[PDB]
Each structure stands twice: as structure tokens, then as C-alpha cells.
Symmetry: C3
């Protein structure tokens, strides 16, 4: 009965493993860094999956309440997302086990959204105050992750379907999210979830480049531009985001940061904006590094688990 959002941790580490993996053909030593990150992410995922299985068996009413909440349900999508990313890692060692994880995560996230995201359209449960960045997780991030994982398995055209579902879902949600943020101050207890606002453009372009064989084209450049705009905005907002202190919820940023790193490797490979690429890759790794150090610190104080 771990907090569900703690899945952000293996998610970010797994995505960062994949970014480093994609540098191996330029810098062979990147593979060891990728492998270490990937093993740590997989180990943490195993632990957190077992904990969540325990929650389901013995704390089921807590899961039921999170599921039916028009806000909290979204974090459940971190489970299949991380499952797919761990599959993508494991593909380097065992394509069969990888493929199983990728399909479980894909079928699971699609079933999840089909059951819950659509149900919101019945009205009367979701309220204006439910308009939170976390909605990107089931609606957008899960589809991008399926897109890139299916492309890894060779299913590029199926990947494009998931890609399009995520990209259009993103464009369709974000307008109402930013209008809500403008009007209604997001309370401090939820502010770390502003980190999820960094994700869409970077997760999108990373998935796109995964499906299109790494071709850095006009769409990719357009996505990077909006991604950087959002990064600058969130940097400016950071003191406000952490008004009430640093917390583990800041791992919400790691998905976007890791996807910035991953897409940077493709831009670099493609000889597009190489200087920006190096900055992005270094910046994202430093920030995730700080998240790791803050987390080790909290673990040493017994301030990690609830």
C-alpha cells in the first residue's frame, strides 16, 4: 500500500536507462550507465509491483477509492507505463520476456482508459477542480509509451495508432488544463504534479522518433520547441511549485526530464541542434541525479514510505 505516485521513481529511472542506451552507438561507455540504471529501475519496479499486489489483496478498498476518484485514478496508469518501460529495458537481454511485459502494459493501459477515462464523460463526478496535470498519465503518456514499445517490437503502424491517440488526446486536454491553472491556484499539496506538465511534448517526440526510425524532421523540431517553452515556464515557476518544501512528488518531473534526454540523443545522432542536445541531456541527468540524492537522503531519515 505504497503511495501509487511512487511509481514515478522506477518510471523516471527506466526512461533514463533507455536514453543512455540510445547513446551507445556514439559513446560505448554509455551502455554500462544504461545497464546500471535499467537494473536499478527494474529492481525498484519489482518491489513496487509486489507492494501494490499486497495493496490489492489486503487494502482493496483503498485501491477502489483511488480508482473511482476523478483525480486519483490517473496515477494507476503509472503501473502499466512502468511495466512497458521495464520491458523495453529487458529487450536488450531477453526479447521474449520484454514482449510479454510490453503487451501486458499495453492491453492494461488501454483497458484502463477505456473503462475510466470514458466514464468521466457521463458527467457529475469530475468537477472543474478535478482538472489536474495527472490526467496526462492515462490519457497521453500511456499511449505514447505503448507507441514506442510496440515500435521496439517491430509493430510500427500499430505504434502510430497509439501515438496518434496520445498526441491528439494531449492537444485536446491541455487547453482546459492551462486555463484552469490560470484561474484556480493549484494547492501546494498537488503542486509537485506540475512536473507532469513538462512531459507531453518530450514524451511525444521521444515516442515519435522511436517509431519513425530516428528521423529528426519538422514535427520533431516543432515538438521540441514547445517542450522547451514549457521547461522555461516550469523553471520560472519552480520556487512557487516548492513553496511548502521539497518532496518526493518532485519525481513527477522525471518522466519529462528523461524524455528530454532520450530525444536529445536522437537530435544529436541526426546532427540537429547538437549544442542544445548536449545541454538538454546534461541538464536532465543532473536534475534526475538530484532527485536520486534527495531520495537517498529521505530513505536515510525514514521519511520515504508512509
Amino acid at each position: 500500500p505504497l503511495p501509487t505516485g511512487y511509481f514515478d521513481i522506477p518510471l523516471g529511472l527506466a526512461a533514463l536507462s533507455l536514453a543512455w542506451f540510445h547513446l551507445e552507438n556514439l559513446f560505448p561507455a554509455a551502455r554500462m550507465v544504461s545497464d546500471v540504471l535499467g537494473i536499478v529501475a527494474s529492481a525498484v519496479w519489482i518491489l513496487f509491483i509486489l507492494m501494490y499486489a499486497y495493496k490489492l489483496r489486503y487494502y482493496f478498498e483503498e485501491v477502489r477509492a483511488e480508482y473511482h476518484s476523478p483525480v486519483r485514478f490517473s496515477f494507476i496508469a503509472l503501473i502499466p507505463i512502468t511495466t512497458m518501460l521495464v520491458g523495453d529495458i529487458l529487450y536488450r537481454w531477453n526479447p521474449l520476456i520484454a514482449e510479454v511485459l510490453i503487451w501486458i502494459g499495453t492491453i492494461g493501459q488501454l483497458l484502463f482508459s477505456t473503462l475510466r477515462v470514458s466514464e468521466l464523460w457521463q458527467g457529475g463526478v469530475f468537477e472543474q477542480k478535478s482538472t489536474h496535470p495527472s490526467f496526462y498519465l492515462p490519457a497521453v503518456a500511456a499511449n505514447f509509451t505503448s507507441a514506442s514499445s510496440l515500435a521496439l517490437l517491430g509493430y510500427h503502424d500499430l505504434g502510430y495508432l497509439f501515438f496518434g491517440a496520445g498526441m491528439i488526446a494531449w492537444i485536446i486536454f491541455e487547453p482546459v488544463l492551462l486555463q484552469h491553472l490560470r484561474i484556480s491556484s493549484l494547492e501546494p499539496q498537488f503542486r509537485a504534479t506540475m512536473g507532469i506538465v513538462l512531459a507531453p511534448a518530450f514524451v511525444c517526440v521521444s515516442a515519435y522518433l522511436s517509431i519513425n526510425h530516428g528521423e529528426v524532421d519538422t514535427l520533431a523540431k516543432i515538438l521540441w520547441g514547445y517542450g522547451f517553452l514549457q521547461l522555461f515556464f516550469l523553471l520560472r515557476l519552480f520556487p512557487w511549485i516548492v513553496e511548502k518544501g521539497l518532496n518526493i512528488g518532485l519525481w513527477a518531473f522525471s518522466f519529462g526530464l528523461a524524455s528530454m534526454a532520450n530525444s536529445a540523443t536522437a537530435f544529436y545522432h541526426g546532427n540537429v541542434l547538437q549544442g542544445v542536445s548536449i545541454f538538454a541531456f546534461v541538464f536532465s541527468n543532473v536534475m534526475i541525479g538530484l532527485l536520486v540524492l534527495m531520495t537517498i537522503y529521505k530513505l536515510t531519515k525514514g521519511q520515504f514510505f508512509l
Copy 2:
């Protein structure tokens, strides 16, 4: 003085005729099916046009009230949409008459939206509760239909202008529609119009493929992906949609369903996702078939016309 929404019937049948037409170069027997559907759609259109002319002549205040309503006005767009689709059918037999119908429908829908859709921006008439799926008809569907009909006539670049008007209008409306649906439960009397939510992506890709010579490219695949997401959501929602019983308003689904079928023929021709294409084509035909059987049933009970 038929209900204006009954134009959904010849619309769906006409769009389905065109889908079958596009299979003739793979399966010659498809032409007869296409021709039968096209004749039935054209006959029903003639009847309903004559009925609406009678409404205009002798029930004009009812038309005036529907026109000025910030909700009901949208269904009027079914008239030029169906007019264009009937033109597209008739092109196989008489390109001159077809071209006349296509221009009448194009000029008519553009004049309609220019007069009424823009007027909404004056404020104070449209209310939050006016945010209904039917708004897609004048704002989106009409433009896509002009795009594809103009391309049939050889005006591809003009078609792209209409295409872009519809595509961007879609992306610009849908965000606020889905947020409204999430917050406000759509009352049962309007719920069959949820079928219109299926239309945008499928109508969009069908129009796109009509203009771009059937090239199944990245944009087409992206559109199909979001289209299928919406289909799955609407399937899950179907029991809720029909909470208060099956009704003729369910023909609102037929535009999206027929456009799923039409786009499937192009995907199949292009050897992209052929299995998905077959499923989509068969599914859409079965559902429209059920709509026809339910309609024959209602006609036999004298429960069709008001």
C-alpha cells in the same frame, strides 16, 4: 416538417455507398452494393429535401427558431452535407449534375457557418449548456465534406483549404466539449448525439485520403489512432448512451461509422493494417445494418415520423 436530424439517415447511407464504391477495384461485386446503397440514400434525400422545403414554406417559424437556437441550428448543416454526398454518388452516373449539387452544398454550408457560427462569438446567447456534439456538424463535418467533394471534382488545393478549416476547427472545439461532458451529465434526450463524437477523426482521415490520392501516411495513421480510441470510449459508454431506450437519434453514429468504413478501404488498398481495416469495415457495416433494421421496425409501427 420532418425532424431535421433525420437527415442523418440519407447521410449515413450515402457515406456508406461511397465506402463500398472505393472497394470496386479490389472486389468488383462491391459496385452493386454501392449502387443500391447510393440509390436508396438519394431517394431518401429527395424525400427529405421536399419535406424540408414544405417546412420552410409552411412551417417557417419552426425553421427560424431552430436556426436561431445556439444548439439546434447545427442540425441544419446535415442538409448541405447530405446534398454533397449525394452529388459524390451521382458523379458515377452524371458528373454535371453531381458538380451542381457539390457546389450548392459547399456554398450553402460555408454561407451557413459564416452567418451562424461566427454570430455565436457575439456572446450572451450560447451558454455553457449549449456545448453539444452537434456543433461538429457545421463547424467540422461540413468542411471535411466540401474538401472531399471538391477533390472528387479535381479541385485538390481548394479541397485542402476546406480540409484545414475543418481539421483546425475540430481541434479547437473538442477540448471544451470533452471538458463539458466530464462536468455536466448530458441529458438522455440528447445522448444519442454522442454518436457525433465518433465522427471527427474518421471523417477527417476519409477527407484527407480523398484529397491526397489515397496515400496512407503518418497523418492518416495518427488520425485513425485517435478515432479508434474514441470508438472504444463510445462502446464502453453505449449502455449509458441508451439508458432511456433505443431511438432513431442513434443514426448520429452512422457518419463516423461510414467514414470508418471508407477510410478502411484506403488503408486496405495501401496495405496498412489490413486486419484492422477488415474489422473496421465489417463492424461499421454491421452497425449501420442494425440501424436500418431498427428503422424498418419503427416504420412498421408508425413510430418514425413525428
Copy 3:
């Protein structure tokens, strides 16, 4: 302490200079027209920059209040936008001075938005009634202008980043703007700002064509289509827009009109929709001409400056 919105005047004239510049390779006499417009725009810009410097030095609390307003802040973005366009003009005579102006305007607009646009997401200051067309200026128009100016300097890939920031920001804002306009009647004192609604698609395609070497492709045609839809809507709305009389605020239309003219030159060069291109170019010049005549008239009556 001129009204900040008066920067619309050199902006529109500068953008129109650039449109004529782009016709020189088809009609050599266009260069003189371009040069005259460009000199007049630059002269007016110099004057208004000096006036605004005087406002900053001696009326600073008025600037501070406009800056912190969640509505009025946007007009400040006209300053760096016009600065960049004047740089683009001056490039024909002095690339070094041009490049300085272009970077000042680019760094300035990016810093401006990063500081102010993001701050809105803290909530509680911006209200639903703050949802005005002027928000396009910092959020959208400034990024497009950087995109095209950077491309002029040879920085095409950097230009694409700014382009994408503007294009996605546009799509993300417009949904909530049009919903607001539908529900809430914009008061007459702000209605001339409806002219800014014309800008996005035309500014977007003009910037795009500047970066992509004038290739009139599917995206360009799609953008033009939505642009024309918006033009038709605004033409229909014009009597309402000017309900309370003609005023200098109507220069808000000139950015979109000039960008219609500029993009028309590219469509014409590309042999796409040449007839539409000629109409667009002539229409936009006539309307800006009328704005100039109305302005000379007001200056002769001493009804220009506050």
C-alpha cells in the same frame, strides 16, 4: 506614455513592407513600395520606442500596472515583435544592425513570456474575464516572429523551435478563447482586439514559409484554409465589432492582414491558388490602406494621441 497598443501601427506597416519585399522577384517595382513602407514603419517604430522609453523613465507606475495586469500585459509584446520586424526590414541594407535587433527582440520576448505568461499559472489573478485575443501576442505572435526572423539570419532549426512553441501555444489557447467569446459578450471597448483573432493562422503560415524556403505544402494549405474561415467570420462580425464607432484599435487587424499578404506572395510564387493569392494580397493592402487613411484623418483632428 503613448498607449502601448499603438505599436500595432509600425507592426502592420513593417509586416506589409516585408510582404511587398517578397514580390520583388516577380515584379521589380514592388521593391520601391516595400522600401517606402519599411522606412515609414521604421520611423514610426523609432518614435514610439522613444516615447515608451520616456514612459518607462517618467511614468513607470503606469508600465508596472500594465505589466502586472493579466490582460494588459500582452500588449507589451508588440514592442519586441515590432523590433524584430524592423530588423527584418533593415536586413536589406545592413545585416549587422538587423541581427542585433532580431536578437534583442527574440531574447526580450522569450524573457517576457517566461516571466509573465508562466506566472499566470499560479492562479488567482487571471480570471475567466481575462480570456482575451490579446493573449495571442506574447504567447503566439512573438514566437512566430522570432521563428521567421531567425530563419532570415540562417538559423532555420532554431527557428523551427520558436515556430513550434507558437503553433502549439496557439492551438492550446484558442479553444478556451472561442468558448469564452461564445458565452461572454466582449465589451465594445475591447472589441477592436477581435482583429487579433485573424492573426494566428496567417502569421503561422507566413513564419512557416519563411523557415521552409517557401515550400507551399499540405501544412501551409491547411493553415490558409482555417485562416480564411476566420477572415469570413470576422467580416460577418465587423458591424458588431465597430458597433460603437471606428477607432485606432482597428490596427489590431493589420498583423493578420499583412501576414495574409505575405503568405499570398509565397502561394503565388509556388503556383498554388494564384487567384486566391491575388485576391488576398489586394484585399489586405486595401484594408491597411483604409487604416492609414483613417489614421491620417485622426491625426488631422488631433484625435490620435491620448
